[PDB]
């Protein structure tokens, strides 16, 4: 019985919460606060440990870009710093392959990164790998068949709909079919054998639509849209279902958590976070 962890986020300022939802009985846990409040970070899990990567601390008296990596042990209910990234990375995307963490893109003030770096836990170290084809902030990331997909984002001029695929054995990137819809701050995950991208902001409106990529057809197909339009949401899969947490919808900060059932192509509301927020790092363990 694994949990959905939610870390950081933003409400009136960047938050430092760590909370976890247990989908089999609907309860929320109030776990240890992060060391430093952060939103636009990403979360992932490696060998039962949760990690929070990048982001920004947008406080009321000015904002700092985070290059930090922190690790939480559900056993000790404790965070611990890990080596920092080579560079501050706000609105970063993250995927895991072979127990190695890929820190993809993000921002540093005006700098929109195309650089990617890899973290090896067994030796607390970050190593620059090959940069992506496009600079990307607010990028969704998804790992499939031992490859990493970078989806959507913003290049420092345009909000993107393009997507790339990284090949770790070859250390190189390749563009793939663009998405139907342009998407900044979408949630990107992997359910069954497809990459999903839900919500985001298209340059005009915050979206509720959900499209999925098929690796063999190379085509994107919309599926049932969500009930609530949202951007800078958190996403993850827990037992064959997609879970989306909060986000911003052009008006307020959502506390709403929707669940996607792929068999029946429907969405439903399964719970509310204890408080509405956007830009959270989400993972399962």
């Amino acid at each position: 019985g694994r949990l959905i962890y939610t870390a950081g986020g933003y409400f009136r300022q960047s938050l430092s919460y760590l909370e976890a939802y247990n989908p089999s009985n609907g309860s929320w846990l109030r776990l240890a606060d992060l060391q430093v409040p952060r939103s636009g970070l990403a979360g992932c899990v490696v060998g039962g440990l949760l990690y929070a990567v990048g982001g920004r601390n947008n406080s009321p008296d000015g904002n700092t870009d985070s290059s930090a990596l922190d690790c939480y042990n559900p056993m000790t209910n404790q965070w611990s710093p890990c080596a920092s990234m080579s560079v501050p990375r706000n609105r970063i995307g993250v995927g895991v392959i072979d127990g190695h963490i890929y820190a993809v893109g993000g921002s540093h003030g005006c700098i929109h990164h195309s650089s990617v770096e890899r973290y090896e836990p067994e030796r607390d170290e970050w190593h620059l790998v090959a940069p992506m084809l496009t600079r990307r902030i607010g990028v969704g990331v998804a790992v499939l068949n031992r490859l990493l997909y970078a989806v959507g984002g913003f290049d420092g001029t345009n909000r993107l709909n393009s997507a790339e695929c990284y090949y770790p054995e070859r250390n190189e990137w390749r563009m793939i079919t663009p998405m139907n819809t342009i998407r900044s701050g979408a949630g990107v995950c992997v359910l069954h054998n497809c990459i999903y991208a839900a919500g985001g902001y298209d340059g005009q409106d915050q979206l509720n639509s959900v499209e999925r990529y098929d690796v063999e057809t190379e085509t994107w197909t919309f599926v049932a849209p969500m009930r609530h339009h949202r951007s800078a949401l958190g996403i993850t899969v827990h037992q064959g279902k997609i879970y989306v947490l909060g986000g911003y919808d052009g008006h307020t900060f959502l506390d709403s958590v929707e669940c996607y059932d792929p068999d029946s192509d429907t969405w439903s509301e399964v719970t509310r976070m204890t408080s509405g927020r956007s830009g959270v790092g989400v993972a399962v363990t």
Binding site: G40, R91, Y201, Q206, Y248
Partner: peptide, 11 residues
């Protein structure tokens, strides 16, 4: 206030 439309954040 001014808010980044894709995240809701300020400035």
């Amino acid at each position: 206030k001014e808010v980044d439309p894709s995240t809701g954040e300020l400035q």
